[PDB]
Enzyme design. Structure first.
Site, PDB file in Angstrom:
ATOM      1  N   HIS A   1       0.782  -1.229   0.000  1.00 28.47           N
ATOM      2  CA  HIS A   1       0.000   0.000   0.000  1.00 28.47           C
ATOM      3  C   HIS A   1       0.807   1.269   0.000  1.00 28.47           C
ATOM      4  O   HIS A   1       1.964   1.297   0.407  1.00 28.47           O
ATOM      5  CB  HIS A   1      -0.907   0.097   1.236  1.00 28.47           C
ATOM      6  N   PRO A   2       0.197   2.341  -0.493  1.00 26.87           N
ATOM      7  CA  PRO A   2       0.870   3.636  -0.505  1.00 26.87           C
ATOM      8  C   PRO A   2       0.653   4.183   0.921  1.00 26.87           C
ATOM      9  O   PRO A   2      -0.374   3.899   1.556  1.00 26.87           O
ATOM     10  CB  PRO A   2       0.082   4.432  -1.549  1.00 26.87           C
TER      11      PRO A   2
ATOM     12  N   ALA B   1      -8.738   3.776   5.209  1.00 29.15           N
ATOM     13  CA  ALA B   1      -9.111   5.182   5.011  1.00 29.15           C
ATOM     14  C   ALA B   1     -10.457   5.153   4.293  1.00 29.15           C
ATOM     15  O   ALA B   1     -10.802   4.137   3.677  1.00 29.15           O
ATOM     16  CB  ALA B   1      -8.082   5.859   4.144  1.00 29.15           C
TER      17      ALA B   1
HETATM   18  N1  LIG Z   1      -1.488   3.548   4.486  1.00 27.63           N
HETATM   19  C1  LIG Z   1      -2.417   2.799   4.297  1.00 27.63           C
HETATM   20  O1  LIG Z   1      -2.971   2.032   5.218  1.00 27.63           O
HETATM   21  N2  LIG Z   1      -2.935   2.758   2.914  1.00 27.63           N
HETATM   22  C2  LIG Z   1      -4.044   1.838   2.669  1.00 27.63           C
HETATM   23  N3  LIG Z   1      -5.230   2.065   3.416  1.00 27.63           N
HETATM   24  C3  LIG Z   1      -6.281   2.191   2.510  1.00 27.63           C
HETATM   25  O2  LIG Z   1      -7.455   2.384   2.798  1.00 27.63           O
HETATM   26  N4  LIG Z   1      -5.843   2.070   1.200  1.00 27.63           N
HETATM   27  C4  LIG Z   1      -4.453   1.859   1.282  1.00 27.63           C
HETATM   28  O3  LIG Z   1      -3.881   1.736   0.229  1.00 27.63           O
END
Ligand SMILES: NC(=O)N[C@H]1NC(=O)NC1=O
Ligand SMILES: NC(=O)N[C@H]1NC(=O)NC1=O
Lengths: 142, 142
Positions: free
Chosen positions: A53-54, A97
């Site tokens: 993930h970013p 998020a």
């Molecule tokens: N930093 C992090 O947790 N990024 C992740 N969370 C999310 O909802 N999408 C992501 O790529």
């Protein structure tokens, strides 16, 4: 159901174990995902998946709300604390998020920074699973 | 007290943080070691430290008792289940050996094989700490 799971969870092992699952509804798929994630894949797999993930404050869509409401100040502290968190825990800050702001997430990060590394590893695993559930609904709702 | 801690714990980070500690008795050193191990080093450090050990059933001294009582049969299953355990959990089987037999340890391994990877990670961390405590006494008793 479709080994495009590496996208629905950066874990190769999770994707693999799911690729060879007797097709089930959108509901049974969720439950089978959680059990594999929480009881079959090892810590090493959790780490691989987090890395995919970013960071929160960067782009590679769960972050649309946060960007439609961001601020240079939030993006600033974020870019700094992400560095601090990675140093301390060994993996990046993971959080589902969504309706979240960079500000709320920056606060959740500072908060979580005070946890023991082992506990941060459990919370990240859970946040990761929520993200995965979120993305699985998007594949079955379509 | 002496950065020869990489030997008293395969964790570079643990060794580092200990190297820069205001010298204390053999007792305060124990307590400062446990806090750093359980609350400061991250999961990645735990993994580095586990890898530094020989599997149970191989040689590189906590295993003296087990070898003075071993059997080809125990050494056999052991060499096999160690492979199975590494595949499942991602790190080797960690246990403070001592007055333990390869047989008792083979049984503790089979038993532990049924734990969730996250829990095996806690138990190994604890077993590792016991080993470390054992070796620290050997440095301060001398
Ligand atoms: N930093 C992090 O947790 N990024 C992740 N969370 C999310 O909802 N999408 C992501 O790529
Ligand atoms: N396999 C394993 O835990 N080996 C470790 N345990 C111990 O007591 N000495 C070691 O080297």
């Amino acid at each position: 159901g479709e080994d495009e799971w590496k996208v629905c969870c950066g874990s190769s092992e999770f994707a693999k174990q799911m690729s060879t699952s007797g097709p089930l509804t959108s509901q049974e798929a969720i439950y089978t995902a959680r059990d594999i994630w929480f009881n079959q894949v090892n810590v090493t797999d959790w780490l691989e998946a987090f890395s995919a993930h970013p960071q929160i404050g960067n782009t590679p869509s769960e972050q649309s709300t946060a960007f439609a409401t961001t601020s240079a100040s939030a993006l600033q502290e974020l870019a700094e604390w992400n560095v601090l968190y990675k140093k301390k825990f060994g993996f990046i800050f993971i959080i589902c998020a969504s309706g979240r702001t960079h500000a709320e997430m920056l606060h959740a990060l500072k908060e979580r920074y005070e946890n023991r590394p082992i506990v941060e590893l459990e919370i990240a695993a859970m946040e990761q699973m929520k993200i995965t559930e979120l993305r699985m609904a998007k594949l079955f709702s379509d």
